[PDB]
Design an enzyme around this catalytic site. Structure first.
Site, PDB file in Angstrom:
ATOM      1  CB  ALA B   9      31.267  54.991  50.084  1.00 29.56           C
ATOM      2  N   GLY B  11      26.867  55.814  45.410  1.00 27.04           N
ATOM      3  CA  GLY B  11      25.712  56.039  44.861  1.00 27.04           C
ATOM      4  C   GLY B  11      25.058  55.472  45.682  1.00 27.04           C
ATOM      5  CE  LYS B 183      38.403  60.417  40.300  1.00 25.81           C
ATOM      6  NZ  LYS B 183      37.347  59.081  40.903  1.00 25.81           N
ATOM      7  CG  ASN B 187      41.578  57.237  40.802  1.00 30.37           C
ATOM      8  OD1 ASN B 187      41.382  58.183  41.364  1.00 30.37           O
ATOM      9  ND2 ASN B 187      40.678  56.760  40.387  1.00 30.37           N
ATOM     10  CG  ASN B 191      42.308  55.515  44.271  1.00 27.85           C
ATOM     11  OD1 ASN B 191      42.308  56.187  44.552  1.00 27.85           O
ATOM     12  ND2 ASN B 191      41.727  54.428  45.003  1.00 27.85           N
ATOM     13  CB  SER B 255      38.056  54.144  46.770  1.00 22.89           C
ATOM     14  OG  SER B 255      39.026  54.139  45.569  1.00 22.89           O
TER      15      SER B 255
END
Lengths: 302, 302
Positions: B9, B11, B183, B187, B191, B255
């Protein structure tokens, strides 16, 4: 604790709804959808789960409500001439007035009208469009920072903050109401201004490098006008980068002023733009980009 | 000049923007080679949709040959496949740009190919994909570029310029290592919790004690970051800043949660187990990250 909601709208109905859901006596004052709320109820559509209130204590005249302990003014600021007629019957000795409306000049015009010690200001960060008569759409956030106009006493701000926290609203307390209002202005002025004018959501303003560059300069002008206004602590210039990265994760958001432009209703140019400009020119600070934006905005809508 | 190794999603999204501004982009497709060789790929954005009628696609890296730059957008559980997928693309002067999540990625490729070839990009993007050859961009997309081995600026600024020309908001730092950890502060709680509870970010943020949890998780990641030989210390208060940042995202599903919903494997190793390794190597108590990592492999083993 008994409350009046003078304003309704996406902001007034949302916090009004959350207050009575946590068991508070909330007296709504409606104009447009009195018959659609008294007959049905108000439906809250939220990202934190939907809920409906079957019965709602709704009124169409302020004198029917009577004196109140608290009054939430969530009105749009173009109807600030209606402060006297809508709020006077709710004023008793001990009544305290809360204002969540955008920009400056709201706390000051209410203190002149009722009394400085009564005025609590609340800077609210709420993503909400609204309404087919009696519906609220919560889209994001909702946090409030509470501050008193006349700066002195601890208990009242804490009792109110805890009350909003009981209702599930993230609530904070500050000593400097002025600074927090000016901190919101750093986001409000460029993003409500450019987006209503260009009729484009925040992501498209942020997509062009030169438009980003414009945004920074607007923000720095706001900060300068803020920093020379009588602040207890200085608003640093790095806050530009902070609010720039903040908006970058809002997606395709259309701010409140843009929605009003799209809906054919008037815009809050006086409170968001002209008033901070007046305060800035009071101390003699150059704010040309804000002024230009303000002017074009009232040129565009008439 | 450019090869895309990932075709996820991010690249696809970055590669599509790269050739849209006229770069010689060569996609390495696997699952959907035939869908993009026939029609091309469609990019749907909040910043207006666009479609590439023709896309230079391949199925083997040895068909593409030597490149100037290879953008790695691989999911980190495919990191064992580094050698087979990238070696045919490497000539003397080829440089490797990693945009994947978590840690170890820069160092693995550095061990495998050469440390003076490696460029780290911490990217922040909201993107679900998936109608073979359809990329959806829901927000953000900004990138911070660092070099693994800290020699020069031209190299890093030429890449930064290249992205900015393509409409990507692209920054540059001297402390790549710090930015990765920066980050990770976001994350890990998000996540992690969202994938485990299968709820979007607004819910995790709605409960008072869950915000306190996120705070605690965040403080651990910072503590594991600050004892890692960073040039400049990550202060806490960066907590308050990701707490408020994520609050502007509304109903966003990270994600890892999306991967859980589709039943595809998760990037636990790079996001969780590698940082926990890095903290334990310096001897840092991280009980919450540990519990999380573990509960997260418990739920996806069955």
């Amino acid at each position: 604790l008994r409350i009046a909601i003078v304003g309704a709208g996406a902001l007034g109905l949302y916090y009004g709804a959350l207050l009575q859901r946590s068991g508070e006596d909330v007296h709504f004052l409606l104009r447009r959808d009195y018959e659609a709320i008294a007959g049905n109820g108000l439906k809250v559509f939220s990202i934190n789960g939907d809920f409906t209130l079957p019965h709602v204590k709704g009124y169409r005249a302020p004198e029917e409500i009577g004196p109140m302990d608290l009054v939430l003014v969530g009105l749009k600021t173009f109807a600030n001439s209606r402060y006297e007629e809508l709020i006077r019957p709710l004023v008793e000795e001990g009544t305290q007035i809360l204002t969540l409306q955008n920009g400056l000049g709201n706390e000051e015009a209410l203190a002149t009208l009722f009394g400085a010690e009564r005025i609590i200001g609340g800077v609210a960060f709420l993503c909400s469009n609204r309404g087919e008569p009696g519906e609220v759409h919560h889209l994001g956030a909702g946090r409030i920072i509470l501050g008193e106009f006349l700066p002195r006493d601890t208990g009242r701000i804490e009792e109110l903050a805890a009350m909003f926290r009981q209702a599930g609203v993230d609530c904070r307390t500050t000593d400097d109401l002025k600074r927090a209002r000016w901190e919101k202005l750093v986001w409000n002025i460029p993003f409500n201004g450019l987006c209503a004018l260009l009729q484009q959501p925040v992501n498209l303003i942020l997509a062009r490098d030169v438009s980003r560059k414009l945004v920074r300069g607007i923000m720095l002008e706001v900060i300068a006008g803020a920093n020379a206004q009588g602040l207890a602590t200085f608003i640093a210039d790095g806050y530009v980068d902070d609010m720039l990265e903040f908006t970058d994760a809002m997606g395709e958001y259309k701010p409140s002023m843009e929605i009003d432009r799209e809906e054919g209703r008037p815009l809050e140019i006086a409170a968001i733009f002209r008033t901070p400009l007046a305060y800035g020119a009071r101390e003699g600070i150059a704010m040309p980009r804000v002024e230009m934006l303000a002017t074009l905005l009232e040129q565009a809508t008439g």
